[PDB]
Design a protein around this ligand. Sequence first.
Ligand code: HEM
Length: 153
Amino acid sequence: VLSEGEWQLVLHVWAKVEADVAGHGQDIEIRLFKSHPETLEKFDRFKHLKTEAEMKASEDLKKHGVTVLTALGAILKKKGHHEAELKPLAQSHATKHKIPIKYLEFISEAIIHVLHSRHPGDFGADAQGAMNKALELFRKDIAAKYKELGYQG
Ligand code: HEM
């Protein structure tokens, strides 16, 4: 569980993300694909993108990044009370996209990296620890929902 203080650090940095959701989304997706190239294989829509500049130029990827971060933001703002928001995400990611928890670890790393790159003065060690706990909770709860659907992490 996160403390109220921890949730407030999470939401304080998230408000920074909300000042440019598209830009943060692009950076996070690109960081994910750069650091863990195998993840790009999961995207029939994007795996044709051959360079970083192509990725940055893709309106489709940018739109998708906003969708991703909008869903994550909606989850984080519930401060753990996110069953209604998490269930449909688990459904699609378990049964359609087939995303293992290890890949959710990869994107969590990418999120931390981008938030620190863009907002170091509002994302120090304690804030990173809080965001890490929030994303750990998300991964734990989604893994439980995966199993409920018959998908083994
Ligand atoms: C913070 C973690 C994540 C969030 C919040 C998130 C959110 C979303 C949302 C909202 C959608 C559109 C609706 C849906 O299909 O559920 C989506 C689609 C998708 N996600 Fe994720 N996602 C996450 C992690 C990942 C990861 C790590 C991968 C792959 C390594 C992935 C692969 C996909 C794919 C392939 C689609 C379909 C894209 C398309 O063709 O339109 N997701 N995601």
